[PDB]
Amino acid sequence: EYPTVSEIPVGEVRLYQIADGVWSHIATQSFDGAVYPSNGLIVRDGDELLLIDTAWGAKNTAALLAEIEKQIGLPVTRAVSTHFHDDRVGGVDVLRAAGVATYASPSTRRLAEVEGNEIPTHSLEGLSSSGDAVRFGPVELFYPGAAHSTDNLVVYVPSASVLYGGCAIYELSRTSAGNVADADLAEWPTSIERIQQHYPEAQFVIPGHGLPGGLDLLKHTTNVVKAHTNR
Ligand SMILES: C[C@H](CS)C(=O)N1CCC[C@H]1C(=O)O
Ligand code: NA
Ligand SMILES: [Zn+2]
Ligand SMILES: [Zn+2]
Ligand SMILES: [Zn+2]
């Protein structure tokens, strides 16, 4: 029942309740003539919401805010971007204009600036070394090491046993490597192993693109990465 890329027109956003107080958000964009989905997360924080990642662009992110207001009706007070690419920070200016406090690691902020992307306002401390974790409202943020990008973070919701892998974790249906231009292929498997080690109790694992599953998505990603490595 997870919404698929064929059931969301570009410009629209769907929410999917994963567990009590936890949703993913799903949006789409076209790339090179194909249509791709992208996921983020929404976590209830008392009477407010924590947003993880934009909906991939300004128009989608405006739609996200409208959909959250319509369906949930609680204010989004903070947002965290999990890496510097446009499916994570594209829409930050929209969030900021709407009064949402935007956050990312200093590593993400630097890379976004170099790329000419939107730059979250606030810097997250305590995430500079592989294996570092910090609590952020109702979630834990974890830097597993370089993988899909050098800055990628994962997010865990301990109340719900939900692990949001972002773009460091691939869905099962992805059989070959995606965008690896900014990746550290050599470190990626090691970084995945850190995630497995730190969150062995995860019940739901959400990739940055595509269908959720369980912890098997980690080994799946390792397999695809290692196949690409040996191309
Ligand atoms: C914008 C995302 C960031 S992980 C991306 O790179 N995509 C998403 C669609 C394909 C691929 C690309 O642009 O090469
Ligand atoms: Na932890
Ligand atoms: Zn990316
Ligand atoms: Zn602020
Ligand atoms: Zn992505």
Numbering used by the authors: 32 to 262
Reproduce the article's own wording on this structure.
B1 MBLs (e.g., imipenemase [IMP], Verona integron-encoded MBL [VIM], and New Delhi MBL [NDM] types) are the most clinically relevant MBLs; these MBLs catalyze hydrolysis of almost all β-lactams, including the latest generations of cephalosporins and carbapenems. Crystal structures reveal that MBLs have a characteristic αβ/βα sandwich fold, that they possess conserved zinc ion binding sites, and that loops flanking the active site are involved in ligand binding. We report systematic studies on the inhibition of four clinically relevant MBLs (IMP-1, VIM-2, SPM-1, and NDM-1) and the model MBL BcII by the four captopril stereoisomers and both enantiomers of a captopril derivative, 1-(2-mercaptobenzoyl)pyrrolidine-2-carboxylic acid (d- and l-MBP).
We determined high-resolution crystal structures for d- and l-captopril in complex with IMP-1 (1.71- and 2.01-Å resolutions, respectively), VIM-2 (1.40- and 1.20-Å resolutions, respectively), and BcII (1.18- and 1.10-Å resolutions, respectively). For the VIM-2–d-captopril complex structure, the ligands were modeled and refined with 100% occupancy, and for the VIM-2–l-captopril complex structure, 80% occupancy was used. In all of our MBL-captopril structures, the distance from the Zn(II) atoms to the bridging thiolate sulfur atom is ∼2.3 Å. In all MBL–l-captopril structures (including those with IMP-1), the carboxylate is positioned to interact with the conserved asparagine (Asn233) from the L10 loop. The inter-zinc distances increased to 3.8 Å and 3.7 Å upon d- or l-captopril binding to BcII and VIM-2, respectively, with the binding thiolate. This is most clearly observed in the case of VIM-2.
